[PDB]
């Protein structure tokens, strides 16, 4: 589920599942950060975990 | 949708909808913070917005 384009609720759901009890932050401002890496381009587990706490 | 018990993906979905382009942080550790206020007890818009960035 992580090796695809993930936007909006789909991206937050992936963060929630990957990060588990660590939690996470979702900062979409200006379509930068996670949006650029996982929504506009193909996401990866490596990149998602950069947004776990 | 915010004035109920919200746990797990249900809580992250509410944060996503309420916080919009501001984004948010989801920190469930030890069932404290947001979990205590919105999952174990009834959530509120006021409390959810405390976790928008």
From Swiss-Prot, chains A, B:
The keyword rRNA-binding does not apply. GO terms for biological process: cellular response to oxygen-containing compound; glucose homeostasis; glucose metabolic process; positive regulation of protein secretion. GO terms for molecular function: hormone activity. Gene3D superfamilies: Insulin-like. Signal peptide: none annotated. PROSITE patterns: INSULIN (PS00262). It holds the Pfam family Insulin. One of its GO terms (cellular component) is extracellular space. Disulfide bonds join 7-39, 19-52, 38-43. Keywords: Carbohydrate metabolism, Disulfide bond, Glucose metabolism, Hormone, Secreted. InterPro entries: Insulin, Insulin-like, Insulin-like_sf, Insulin_CS, Insulin_family. It is found in: Secreted. Heterodimer of a B chain and an A chain linked by two disulfide bonds. Insulin decreases blood glucose concentration. It increases cell permeability to monosaccharides, amino acids and fatty acids. It accelerates glycolysis, the pentose phosphate cycle, and glycogen synthesis in liver. Belongs to the insulin family. This is Insulin. It comes from Balaenoptera physalus (Fin whale). The gene is INS.
């Amino acid at each position: 589920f992580v090796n695809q384009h993930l936007c909006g609720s789909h991206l937050v759901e992936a963060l929630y599942l990957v990060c588990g009890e660590r939690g996470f932050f979702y900062t979409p401002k200006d379509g930068k950060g996670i949006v650029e890496q996982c929504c506009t381009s193909i996401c990866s587990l490596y990149q998602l975990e950069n947004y776990c706490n």
